[PDB]
């Protein structure tokens, strides 16, 4: 309750290292805030008696400094190491900088050091004496150099070591094997290199090992089988090569395994195909090969499977619907040279599916099957079914479908009306096909649709008026997409768009487009459009991109469109237009090919 005087000196030193005052602390000698540091915010005290200090003069001792998200700036003063009873130092998510005093890593009573999300820099101190530390958390800072080779010399109680999102380099020190009690080890997102020292596989209590985003190389040792408590293993984005070891019977707690973007080859180990515990599996972007085999009686926890962008061949496994928890499958860039199995009509757990660029044949059969997966919300068929016909068979219904992408298939046919059976559609991409006919008016009736890519087809006739009444354009999970490659994490990462470009469309642009106030992107380029440009286009308040180029448009560019305050890209190029322009800031390539 009454602040120890030596702790006050120490906290005073701590304040001196800061750029700005902490509210509630007595920052200067002026008796406004109380002088008792135990009264201050972020400071917790315990009596000297309860800490087992036998001093005749009792006092409250500072046991906890909890400063998270305080906008603290400046260095971490060497004086903090003068708080000899400090158990918890939590400075997470502040603006702090400078290097770390070796004195801090000398505190005998410290349980928790959380410096995460700051700007700290320099070498990490090589001598670390923290006999009481449970938690070493430096995640997201600017530290560089070798990980201290002596790191585990004195850390007898260590549970969590998080060095992730820093600049550390070199190999994982062989001494890492002496952190016997460690449960969480993150090294992820550093500069680390070389092979994993065999010594790491001695850490028997390890439940989370995160190595992703480094330069680590060599093989993945069969000694991995020794880390028997592993829940989560992430080796993604490294230089690892060879085969994935067959040790997954031994890791029976492993629910998360990500090896993606490595050099792995060979078949998936059969034990992984039998793993009872595995929930998230991502092997994508390797050289893995063979027939894909999954034992669905065994893998009852499997919820997400990403084998994409691998060297596998053979058929699409027909037993997959029997993995009854499996909700998401990314099978893209596996060259099946096959049809989707009929059993897929029974895959009722499936919510997300991508066969993109997988050599799938017979879109007719494929869709007649997949319509029966009642929970399917997203489907990616891009780059398959080359030159085939997009079936108009009316009996097709994808009821819960949110996202439908079949692009760059060169598909013949028209926009099929059975798509109106997907009333909750958010994203539709039919682009880069051979599609013909007119653009169906019922598209305007889809109240959740914010993204429509019809571009690069043979479409003729008018722009349907209903598009100007599109509700989501008028008014206000993991398996990412790439746009042709820029990554988008979910459907809503795509800004609302109408792309009708590279068709034969005719008629004019409707004034009612000005009703679409949530539209970010309108691309009408390379059509046969005629008439004027409505002044009502000034009504689309969210418009960023408007490309009318390569059309037959005439008249004046309405000065009113100057009212579009977010408009970042504008092209009227290669039309026939005349008169003044309101906007001096758009390049000439935007106005060129007009006369006037």
């Amino acid at each position: 309750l009454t602040c120890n005087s030596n702790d006050l000196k120490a906290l005073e030193g701590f304040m001196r290292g800061l750029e700005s005052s902490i509210d509630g602390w007595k920052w200067n000698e002026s008796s406004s805030f109380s002088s008792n540091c135990c009264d201050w915010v972020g400071i917790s005290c315990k009596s000297s008696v309860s800490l087992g200090l036998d001093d005749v003069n009792e006092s409250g001792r500072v046991v906890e400094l909890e400063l998270g998200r305080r906008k603290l700036s400046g260095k971490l003063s060497e004086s903090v190491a003068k708080l000899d009873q400090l158990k918890v130092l939590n400075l997470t998510h502040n603006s702090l900088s400078g290097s770390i005093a070796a004195s801090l890593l000398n505190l005998s009573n410290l349980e928790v050091l959380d410096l995460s999300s700051n700007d700290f820099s320099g070498l990490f101190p090589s001598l670390i004496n923290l006999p009481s530390l449970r938690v070493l958390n430096v995640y997201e800072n600017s530290f560089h150099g070798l990980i201290p080779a002596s790191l585990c010399n004195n850390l007898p109680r260590i549970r969590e070591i998080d060095l992730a999102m820093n600049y550390f380099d070199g190999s994982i020190p062989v001494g890492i094997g002496n952190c016997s009690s460690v449960e969480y080890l993150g090294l992820a997102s550093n500069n680390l290199s070389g092979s994993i020292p065999q010594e790491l596989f001695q850490l028997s209590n390890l439940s989370v090992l995160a190595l992703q985003n480094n330069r680590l190389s060599g093989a993945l040792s069969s000694k991995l089988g020794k880390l028997s408590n592993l829940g989560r293993l992430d080796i993604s984005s490294n230089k690892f090569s060879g085969k994935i070891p067959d040790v997954f019977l031994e890791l029976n707690k492993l629910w998360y395994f990500s090896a993606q973007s490595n050099l792995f080859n060979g078949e998936m180990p059969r034990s992984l195909s039998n793993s009872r515990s595995i929930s998230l599996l991502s092997l994508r972007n390797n050289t893995l090969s063979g027939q894909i085999y999954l034992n669905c009686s065994a893998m009852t926890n499997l919820t997400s499977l990403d084998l994409a962008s691998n060297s596998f061949s053979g058929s699409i496994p027909s037993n997959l619907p029997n993995c009854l928890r499996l909700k998401t499958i990314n099978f893209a860039k596996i060259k099946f040279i096959a049809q989707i199995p009929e059993s897929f009509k029974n895959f009722q757990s499936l919510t997300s599916l991508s066969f993109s660029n997988s050599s799938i044949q017979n879109i007719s059969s494929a869709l007649e099957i997949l319509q029966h997966c009642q929970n399917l919300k997203t489907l990616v068929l891009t780059l398959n079914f080359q030159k085939e016909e997009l079936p108009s068979v009316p009996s097709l219904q994808f009821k819960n479908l949110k996202v439908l992408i079949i692009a760059s298939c060169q598909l013949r046919g028209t926009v099929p009306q059975w798509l109106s059976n997907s009333p909750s559609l958010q994203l539709l991409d039919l682009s880069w096909n051979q599609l013909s006919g007119t653009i169906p008016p019922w598209l305007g009736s889809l109240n959740s649709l914010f993204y429509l890519d019809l571009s690069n087809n043979t479409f003729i006739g008018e722009i349907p008026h209903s598009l100007t009444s599109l509700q989501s354009l008028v008014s206000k999970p993991d398996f990412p997409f790439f746009k042709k490659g820029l990554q988008y994490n979910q459907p809503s990462s795509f800004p609302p768009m109408i792309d009708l470009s590279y068709n034969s469309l005719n008629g004019s642009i409707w004034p009612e487009f000005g009703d679409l106030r949530q539209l970010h992107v309108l691309n009408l380029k390379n059509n046969n459009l005629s008439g004027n440009i409505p002044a009502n286009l000034s009504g689309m308040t969210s418009l960023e991109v408007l490309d009318l180029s390569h059309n037959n448009l005439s008249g004046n560019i309405p000065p009113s469109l100057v009212k579009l305050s977010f408009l970042s890209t504008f092209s009227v190029a290669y039309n026939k237009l005349s008169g003044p322009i309101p906007f001096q800031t758009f390049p000439n390539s935007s106005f060129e090919g007009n006369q006037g």
Partner: peptide, 5 residues
């Protein structure tokens, strides 16, 4: 267009 990988 959109693909996955």
């Amino acid at each position: 267009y959109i693909y996955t990988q």
